[PDB]
Structure formats: C-alpha cells, structure tokens
Write a protein that binds this ligand. Sequence first.
Ligand code: ZN
Length: 775
Amino acid sequence: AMQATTTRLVNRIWGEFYSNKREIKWDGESLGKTSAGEPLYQQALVGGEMVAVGGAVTLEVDDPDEMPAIYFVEYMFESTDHCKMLHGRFLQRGSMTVLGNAANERELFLTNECMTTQLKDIKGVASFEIRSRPWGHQYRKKNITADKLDWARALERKVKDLPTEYYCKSLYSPERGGFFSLPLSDIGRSSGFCTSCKIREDEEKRSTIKLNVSKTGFFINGIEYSVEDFVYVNPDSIGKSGRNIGLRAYVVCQLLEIVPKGSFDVKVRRFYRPEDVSAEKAYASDIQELYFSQDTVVLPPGALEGKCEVRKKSDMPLSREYPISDHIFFCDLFFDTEIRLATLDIFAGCGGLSHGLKKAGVSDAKWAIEYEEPAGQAFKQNHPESTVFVDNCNVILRAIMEKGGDQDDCVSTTEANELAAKLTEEQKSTLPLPGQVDFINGGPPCQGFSGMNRFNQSSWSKVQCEMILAFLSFADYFRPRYFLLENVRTFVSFNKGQTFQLTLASLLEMGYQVRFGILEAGAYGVSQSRKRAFIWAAAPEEVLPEWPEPMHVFGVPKLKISLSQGLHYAAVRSTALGAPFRPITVRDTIGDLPSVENGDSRTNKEYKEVAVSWFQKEIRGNTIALTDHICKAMNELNLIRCKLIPTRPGADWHDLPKRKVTLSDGRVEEMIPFCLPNTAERHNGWKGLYGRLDWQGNFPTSVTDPQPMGKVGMCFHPEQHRILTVRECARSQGFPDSYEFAGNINHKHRQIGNAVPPPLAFALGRKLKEALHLK
DNA sequence: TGACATACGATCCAATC
DNA sequence: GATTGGATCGTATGTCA
Ligand SMILES: [Zn+2]
C-alpha cells in the first residue's frame, strides 16, 4: 500500500494524489490560378493586420457569451464577382472535446471540417503557431525548460489582459476516436485544392449502388462484387450465461446472376453449415466447413455483407492461427434438404498479455515487474528468458531514476527511497535505462473502478486507482515508441470520466498520438463475456494501430464511449446479427476433460479421451500432461446444497427446498442461506447464485475467487457436483494447456482471473505488426 | 496470522413505452 | 421523457479450530 512515485509533469497535470469601414487589400501578387480561373494570393491586409496562409482568423457567433470560432487559412482566391474569399479548416478548442476540464486553454486541435467565407465576415486575426517538437528521451529536459518559459509568458499576458497565443500539434478525429499527427505536407498549400474536401468527395462517392459498364458487376459500400464471387448474407434476409442460443452466423453464398428488374436484384446459391443439422454435428466439425446445396434465392443488393473464399480441403492454408482472421472456408460434402520490440511489461501477473504479444511477433518481454511471489514465479516459469523484478513498481521507478541521475525530477515517499537503497548491485545493474525500451505494456489494477466494488472511496481502493500515475510516469521517463494500456470498461466512466480525461491529457502533454476503445473478448474466440478498455499511444512519426476485426457471433450490442457534445464512438461492430464463425460453447471448452470429485488435489494427471471439437484440438496441441485439474473443497452444507440443484439450464438457488439440515457434528442449519431472500428485490433476485452452467451457453466473467454465493455466481459444473477446476477456468480465458501456474489453488485462481485473454492479445499484436511495416 | 464462510450499494445503458 | 431488467478481473466483517 505505497503511494505512487511520479515525475514532475504527471504531478503537475493531476495534482490530487500526493502533492497538489475596413480596407481589405491583397498583398503581393498572385502565384497561380484555380481551375475555374481565379487568382490565388498569399497575404492580405484587413484592418491593418496581416492574414496569411498558415495563420488563424476568428469568425463571429450568434450568442454573445460563447467564444468565436477559429479557422486555419488554407487558400485565398478572387472569384468572378471580384469577391475576396478564403477557405479554412476548423480549429476546435480542447474544452469542446473528450478532454473536457483537463484541457489546456491555449491548445487547439485541427479537424476535417471546412468553411468558405468572404473576408468581410471575419472578426479578427489570432496569434497562432504550429508546434513541431523533436521526439526522444534526450530532449525531455530541454522540452521542460522551454515549457516553463512558455508558462510564465502566459500568466503575464493574462495579468495585463493581452490577446491569447494559441498553438496546435494534433488532429482530432472523433469518428476514429483519437488524436493523430498533423499531416504537415498537406496543410497550408495556398493552392485551390484542399485534402479534407477531397476526403468528403471520395466519401460521398462510396455511398451509392453503381453497376459496372458490363453489368457483370456492382459497387456497394466501396466493395466490388462480380459474378461467381462468394459472399456473406445476413441470416434474417433469407429466412444466465447463455444468450447466443439461436444466434446464427453469416450465410455463405455464390453469386450467379444479376436480374434487371438502375435498380437490380441478385441471384445466389447458398451453402449450409454443420450447425444447420444438429448441435452434435457442430460439436464434432471444423469451424471452416460448409456443405453444398442447390437452393437458390433472389435478394436485394443491400442484403450482402462482404466477400469470402471457398476452397477444397486440399487447397487450404497450412498456417493455423487460433484467432482465425482468415475469410476462407472449405467444402467437401453435400446437404440434401526484424521488427521485434524490446518490451517492458508493468503489472505483469502470470503473463497472458505478454504471451499473446510474444506470439504475434512484436514483443520480447525483456523486463517485467510483478510484486506477488506466486505470480512472478509463474511469469518466470512461462517466460524463462525474461528479467523479472518482484518488487513494487514505485521502488523500481525510484531506483531507475536514481541510476539516471534525475533524483530531482522524482516525486517519491521516504519509504520508497529507503527501499530503493536496499537493492543489491547485481539487481541494479540489470535495470533498464532510457533509450533501451521501445514498447511499454501493462494492465493497471481493475479493482478501484470495478462496479462490483461496494467500497470504492476507501483507502485501499484509492491507492489501487493511484497506480495509473506511476504507470504514466514510466512512459514519461522512458518515452517509448509504443505504449499499451489495459483496464475495465468502467475505467472510462469512473467518476464522470475524470480519470480517463486526465490520462488522455497526460499522454498528450508528452507529445503522443492517442486512441481509445472498448472490446468484447467473446467475439475473438473465447466462451466468455469480458468487456475491456484499451488505450494505444504512439510517437509522432509512427503509425497508430487499428482495431482487430471480430469474427465470432456474440450477443453484445454496440460498446460505445461517450465523446462530449452528444457524440459517441464504437471501436468495432456488433456480431449479434451475423459473423463469419459460430460462437464457442461450454462443451467446446471443457467437454473432453475427465471427471473429478469435490476437492481434488492431484496436480499431474493424464488425458483419457481424445479431442473432438476444434477448440479442444487446438488448445491441447501436442501436450500429454494434464496439469491443474483441481477444484476447491466445499464444506458439508454447501456440498449438500450443490447436489440438490438440478442439471437444467437456468438452475440456481430458487430450486432449493425450505428445510432444516442436521450435520455430522449435531448442528442444525437451514438449507436456504439467510442472506439470499433477505436482500433480494434490490438485486434482481440473485439469479445464478448456486447456479449451474449450460452446455450450450458460455462462461460468466472470470473472477479471482469463484464461489457459489458471490456477485457473479455460476461456478458449478453442468453435470458434476463440484466447482469448476483451475484448468477449466484457464480454458475459458484462452490459455494453452501447456501454460503453468504457481502457488496454492487460490493464487492460481487469482492469476487466471486477472489476466488478459491470450487470444485477444494476439489479435492486438497482429495489428501492431501491421502498423510496424507501414512506417 | 491465516483460512474460510457470510452478507451485500450505487451507477450505467440498452430495449420496450 | 419513463421505467424496469441486466451487468459483474469485489470488499469488509465475524467466527474458528
Ligand atoms: Zn476544404
């Protein structure tokens, strides 16, 4: 329970943790002409002051109490009517963005909105500059100095009531959910052409249904469809821990003809899927298998959702990735009706995020920081070439800053200073130094903001929330190329969004490109409902990664993030009405494991049955040792209650009779727990407590302590009178069967419940790998 | 100290009106 | 605009053997 060690920058940004008639003349002469035949100018005198390409003008607004609008000048031209006109791009204020009250008063953000006005209608010319600043760990001490000089000159200008000076260094895209680098070669060309207008024109050209001159094809949503192509159709256009029951995947069809009926209709021939026969057939079949039919449909062009490929089993790719990512299917039967980055992992845990990023090919987890002995031991067991520190991150940061000589840039506690002096010389020799770390990744605690926390204004929750500041100080000190932050969904709305806004403002104060999003794990290949928030940060001359495409059906709506002024952003689509692949069930995950009783402790066992489903075949791999198939022991009364709950979908504590139980030691208890009928009707009746899983459903969210009378509940096996084992809980989060956990059973459950799914980490790392090849 | 069992609030957001 | 269900890497307290 140690308070965070920050740099001065983070301390100053947060401040609430440890320490607080007019004559209009064309200047010069034209330098070219617009295609319409209009002279272009570079400078103009308005009211005695100079308006130039690269400056800013203010336009007047209706309501008086609102501040005027600022526009960046792109070009000036003289039209046929001899009217003096300019084109401008909108410069938004930081207070009108997702930053809110955390934004600077002098910082403006460039947008893709445009304007064209006459020079008579401008109110004034503003003092404006574009800030381009070098990137590196070797410049941050110089950047501090200038920044101080910039702050002082501001307050004096404020106390004398002088005009404000503005600067711009980023571009705000609310439809991409982020702040991006300025395209410096496309702005201020003083030419009649503008890139934002070109973007809008191309956008409006790509929303129309147009036929090819040969009626052999058609353009829709920016995709070209030809005859004999394979296409996706919504299932509706042709015809608890479980809500994917009856959610169907895309229908795969071959396009045969274009029917005239310019309006037209399409003719398709459909394929069938293994789950269109039975659930037993879908259990034993591959996810990429289809069946041939002769059934033909006539559809409107708007029923098509994308293109795919259908091959033979022999011609399939020989690379097998667990998140499939491939739009390729195979048909056999018939249906009769180089760039590896040096990575520092902070708050490493057991290593799921690392595991995925290492499988993607972008990270070598060279250093890791984990204060818990069993978790550090597990990380060392699974990643043997990594240097693991089993200290507090505050102590490690203090030691690194002492090694660099910047003790006076560090804000720390006496306790952390004393603990940093106790490190041995070999430990201090192995610490990373700035200029050696290219990637920083980490999942700060998820307990301060989680909604399940009844006590969030207590002393323990506040420090866990405060670890964000230490995580940001690591990025401030090391200035890496790439930065990845992971947390819960409620991190973006914790206390009216202030923590999210302050994190974004801190990342922007250093000079990063930042983007944010929320992702659902079940759409990427796990049988779980897990909603997580991700933040990407990149250097000004890097490419900021995109988001991975979800390819599994899962019944979750649009995960949205609130952007101020009534706007919202969604990172990915909803797969509830259709997706390339079917959902993963509980029987797909745990249906091949052998039977165990209550409180089994044998750690090393043997597999008895072979893998049947796709998920089983690819989680087992080539492993012959079954490890950690162990469950927690329930007492006599809880085991009596567990055996008396039916093996039906949706069975919970409401199925327990009102009765008195005599135990072995002559105690008389009551079968129904007193707390469950007491606080009900405030909590939706506690559905799923003492609840059994459904074979055709999915798992609930993986928590650190699975117990029958918890908030989440539903830890009972669908058929066996026990709680789920460690291996089953690791299979629900996507861990391979060869992954090793350390400690007692409680520590292993804690390690599994805290992790990022390795499949989702691999999906994110693949997009980072694509971003690294585009530089 | 530790292990294990019990008791249990407020906010956000999408269907259904 | 109104109001219901559903969501969900939990924390504090008391007994105990
Ligand atoms: Zn324009």
